[PDB]
């Protein structure tokens, strides 16, 4: 998070803000504001770091950054409010909306898609092909089928050496 001494986004570009009293600097810093003012500072840092035009807010890049800041605020809220079902819904929906944005950005501007993933630390994932419950019977059988395959591969290798050894004895 930005330091508490950081000035608000509105008072950071007023002339002479560095020569005011220390008390005036506290009243205009993040320490004396609500958390939403701190999120506007985080959003500004990501823009200058990632997007080419930090002033264009309607581009698909700015939207992914703005939504990524909201997602982080929901995660911090839920870390303290674990039974808040309403905000748990807002988090999961926001993550879905960002994935849809990333999908559209990956399809249209790959170079910008790579810089967004690096800048925000997002690990893009492709959706599953099928949506179906993995109940106990299936989970158990799938584990057994993988063990059976692993054991058959070992027996097929031990049938190569014996055949190779016997072939050399003929010579």
């Amino acid at each position: 998070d930005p330091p508490p001494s950081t000035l608000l986004k509105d008072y950071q570009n007023v002339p002479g803000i560095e020569k005011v009293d220390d008390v005036v600097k506290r009243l205009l810093s993040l320490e004396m504001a609500n958390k939403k003012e701190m999120l506007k500072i985080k959003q500004e840092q990501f823009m200058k770091k990632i997007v080419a035009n930090p002033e264009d807010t309607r581009s698909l890049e700015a939207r992914i950054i703005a939504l990524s800041v909201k997602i982080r605020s929901y995660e911090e809220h839920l870390e303290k409010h674990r039974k808040d079902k309403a905000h748990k819904r807002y988090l999961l929906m926001s993550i879905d909306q960002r994935k849809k944005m990333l999908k559209n950005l990956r399809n249209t501007n790959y170079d910008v898609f790579e810089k967004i993933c690096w800048g925000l630390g997002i690990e893009y994932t492709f959706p599953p092909l099928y949506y179906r419950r993995a109940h106990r019977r299936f989970v158990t059988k799938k584990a057994l089928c993988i063990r059976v395959f692993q054991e058959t591969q070992k027996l097929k290798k031990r049938r190569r050496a014996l055949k190779a050894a016997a072939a050399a004895q003929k010579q």
């Binding site: 106990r136 158990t140 057994l144 059976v148 054991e151 058959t152 027996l155």
Partner: protein, 71 residues
Amino acid sequence: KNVLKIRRRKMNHHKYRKLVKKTRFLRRKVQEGRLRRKQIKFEKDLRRIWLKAGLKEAPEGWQTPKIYLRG
């Protein structure tokens, strides 16, 4: 609208709940028997897999769990 269709369903449900309550000890013995055959049918399916693949016994260290018990 009248509630004649609801009333037919109402009596059906009442008589069903009463039947289940009257025979809940027989049904509990039947349910137990079905879950056993269900576990056996599941063990046969896994055994069919490793036998058809050429193996003679279950893979080393495999134990078919009981996936239908209350525990």
